[PDB]
Structure formats: structure tokens, C-alpha cells
Amino acid sequence: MEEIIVRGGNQLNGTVRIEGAKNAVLPILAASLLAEEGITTLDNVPILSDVFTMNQVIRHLNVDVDFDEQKNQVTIDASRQLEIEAPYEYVSQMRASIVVMGPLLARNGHAKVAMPGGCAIGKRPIDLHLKGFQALGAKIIQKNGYIEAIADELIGNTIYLDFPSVGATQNIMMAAVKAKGTTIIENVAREPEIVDLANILNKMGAQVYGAGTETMRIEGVDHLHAVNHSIVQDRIEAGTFMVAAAMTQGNVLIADAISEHNRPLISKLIEMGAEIIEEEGGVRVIGPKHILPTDVKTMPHPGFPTDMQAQMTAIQLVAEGTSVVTETVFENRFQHLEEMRRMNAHVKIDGNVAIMDGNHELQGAEVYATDLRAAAALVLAGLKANGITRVRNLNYLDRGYYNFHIKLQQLGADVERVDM
Ligand SMILES: CC(=O)N[C@H]1[C@@H](OP(=O)(O)OP(=O)(O)OC[C@H]2O[C@@H](n3ccc(=O)[nH]c3=O)[C@H](O)[C@@H]2O)O[C@H](CO)[C@@H](O)[C@@H]1O
Ligand SMILES: *[C@H](C)[C@H](O)P(=O)(O)O
Ligand SMILES: [Cl-]
Ligand SMILES: [K+]
Ligand SMILES: [K+]
Ligand SMILES: [K+]
Ligand SMILES: [K+]
Ligand SMILES: [K+]
Ligand code: NA
């Protein structure tokens, strides 16, 4: 139905406002299932397709969910007896749908949830979620396609995560808050959305210690209640605009940006010649006349985030030399580079390593997003391409960006969203 059309060759200048984080609001919506009494009010909720999908997941569990889009506010009433089967129709259309399992085990000792969807960028198993629930006393059944977890009593345990999985950390945390005694989770995700989640849980009456460190300690409680919470700013949307500014000889203030949440990105953009200044109003990015090449290796926190990789390849592909990216987190997150070949990108891919020769002019082309960050990366490449770039499959973009074309237009970019 729709495409984003870009004409390249404009400098970006001005101030951009950033929405609440996609990847904080979704597990916090799941956490609202733990509030046995009261009404949860979430503020700074972004208008994203994943929020509408997650709200339908939760409503099917016998919960009232009201999204006031004008106020960026969601109210949740989970005070009734929860149903325990999440609806495949919605679960299959996003990733974070799976993290209703933890709260359903905490409230009811019973959860039925299918394998989730989301960005089609690798195998994306959930084995570590299921291992953690087993460690807390759940029996895990697969009937013919389905995943059922049953716990007559959740009991705290020590749980070592083989990989610091964001979703597994969230799912296990949300079961453990109502487990009997102490849970210790070793090698947890340290991403700042884990901290935002822990902070709302603690406000709701939980005892979650060590969020943002490698070891979490949870002391089970009998009851959680509803609170008011404001979602943390979206560090990935923030970072996307930092890259846009850095690649267009721009001067952009990212309003109220949290520099602590983008230390790797800021460091790498400085290596490429950006000037980045922490100001009273936000983080200012000044793009250089001569973009310098740099290498990127994705890693779990505290290394370079995989959710900035695609966007970063757009600036690497216009740098004055050869850059390398190594994608260590996901197995299939280079399809945007194949599309950028249509735009005259010179890139060699060998397993998890891509080598980019930026000494070529990108040319406008019709390109097809395959996933959320790939869509943003193709629009960014458009900002530097000679002529007209048409970015298609905006369903992927709408999972994580609100008004992306309007925010770019307001910085002086020639970007439109139109019907095909
Ligand atoms: C909705 C949401 O918050 N999405 C984010 C979340 O996804 P998500 O929570 O799916 O990401 P994980 O941290 O779990 O996955 C990272 C890697 O861990 C491994 N793994 C994970 C779980 C498991 O049970 N077994 C296993 O092996 C896989 O190698 C996977 O490739 O964190 C990712 C990593 O920063 C981000 O890219 C996503 O945007
Ligand atoms: C792309 C990786 C998205 O953030 P998810 O919601 O599928 O994880
Ligand atoms: Cl996607
Ligand atoms: K319980
Ligand atoms: K039960
Ligand atoms: K917050
Ligand atoms: K170049
Ligand atoms: K890879
Ligand atoms: Na969508």
C-alpha cells in the first residue's frame, strides 16, 4: 500500500523528539498482568504496531486495556481471574508476546503460549526462557506445536543463563517475583530496559535487586499492585537519528537523549569524525565533511547493540574507505546489505562478516525492507543516495518507529510517506 520516498543530498538540522522505548513498553505491558489490584497507568507509550498487538495479547487474558493515543497513555485492569492461553493470532506477530508466560505463571501457575514472531533475523529460540521456568518448578509440555507451562508452586532457585538473553531475563524475572524464597539469576541481560522493568516491578511491591548488573537477586512476595510508570526514552530511535545527523553533515539535537544508553554508538560515530556534545537539552550530533571508515562488532550490553547495526552500515557504506561489520548476536541480520546493492553499495558478505567499500556514490532505487531496523537503514541510505529511493514494506518500520518520515522532514530531509 505505502512507501517512503527519499531524495538524497540534504543536510539535517534542528531538534528531534524521541518516543518511549519499544523494547521497554512491551515487557512493561506484560508486567501489568502481575497487578492483582488497581489500574496500571503507563505514560510515554509509543504509537507502534507492536503496542496494539501486545494490547490484544493481554486483552485475551481477561484484562481491560485502553490506549489513549493523544495522551500516549495506556490503562490496564488485570484485577480479574486471568485466562491462561495467549492468542496465537497476536503472539505470532511480534517477539515480546512470549514474555506474558512469566506473569501468567506468577498469577495462575499455568500458561499456554505459542512460539512468538518478530524480526525474521535468525532462529530466535526461547530455550533459555523454558530452562528458567523449569528451574523455578514448572513442568514444560509441548502438545503438537503448543508450549504449556504448569507450576503448582514456583520455588526460587539459582539459574545460570548461557547467554544474557533480554527476553529470558524479563520472563524469568516476572515469574520469580512471586516464587517462594530467593531466586538468583546469573549472567542476565544488562540492557537498560531490564532496569526500567525492575523499577516498575519494585514500585508494584516486588523485590528485584541488581538490574543492570550481571547478577539479579529476587525475593518472592505474595501480592503485586498497580502503579503509574513513564516508559524510558527509546535509545534505538535516538541512535537512528544520531546516525542520520552524522551521515548528512548535520547538526541535530536529540532532545533529552540519555548518553549513558548509547556509549558504543557515540564512541563509534566520533571515530567516523562526528562531533557529539552533551547539552542541557539533549545530545547534539554534528556530522563531518569527511566521514571516516570504522569497524563494528555487535555484542550484548555493554558492547555495540545489534539494534543499531543496520543503521550503522548505512553510514559505513558512505565513509571514505573500507569498513567491516561483524554481527555476533543474530545469524540472518544482513539482508538490508543485499538490498543496498540495488543502490550501488559495494559489499562482500562471508558468514557473520560484511566488508563495505564506501568509495562509491549510492544511487536511488526501489528497495524492500525485510525487518524493522533494515527499514530504517534503507531510509538512511536514501538520505545519501543520488536521486530517488523508494523504501517498501513499511509494516516492518511501523513496529518500532512513529512518524519517522515527519521527524526527518522537520530536520530538512526530503522524505515523504505516500500510497503506491
Ligand atoms: C522485543 C525485544 O525486546 N526485542 C529485543 C530483544 O530481543 P530478544 O529478547 O529476542 O533477544 P535475546 O537477547 O533473547 O536474543 C539474543 C540471542 O540470544 C540467543 N537466545 C535467546 C533466547 C533463548 O532462549 N535462547 C537463545 O539462544 C540467540 O542467540 C539470540 O540470537 O533483545 C534483542 C537483543 O538486544 C534486540 O535485538 C531486540 O530488538
Ligand atoms: C526486531 C529485532 C524487533 O525489535 P523484535 O520485536 O522482533 O525483537
Ligand atoms: Cl520486523
Ligand atoms: K506464584
Ligand atoms: K496450576
Ligand atoms: K522510566
Ligand atoms: K564515500
Ligand atoms: K550474523
Ligand atoms: Na506493523
Author numbering: 1 to 420
Question: Would you copy out the relevant sentences from the publication that reported this structure?
Answer:
MurAA catalyzes the first committed step of peptidoglycan synthesis, transferring an enolpyruvate moiety from phosphoenolpyruvate (PEP) to UDP-N-acetylglucosamine to produce UDP-GlcNAc-enolpyruvate and inorganic phosphate. MurAA comprises two domains with the active site Cys119 located in a flexible loop (Ala114–Ile126) that is solvent exposed in the ligand-free state. We refer to the domain containing the active site loop as the “catalytic domain” (residues 21–232) and the other as the “C-terminal domain” (residues 1–20, 233–419).
FOS inhibits MurAA by blocking access to the catalytic site making Cys119 inaccessible to PEP. Fosfomycin is an irreversible inhibitor of MurAA and is structurally analogous to the substrate PEP. Based on the structure of E. faecium MurAA, both the A149E and G220V mutations are located in the catalytic domain of the protein but distal from the active site. In addition to being quite distant from the active site, positions 149 and 220 are proximal to each other, and are both surface exposed, suggesting that these mutations could comprise part of a protein surface involved in interactions with other proteins. The structures of E. faecium MurAA with FOS–UDP-GlcNAc and by serendipity UDP–MurNAc suggest that, like other members of the MurA family, the protein transitions from an open to closed conformation upon UDP-GlcNAc binding.
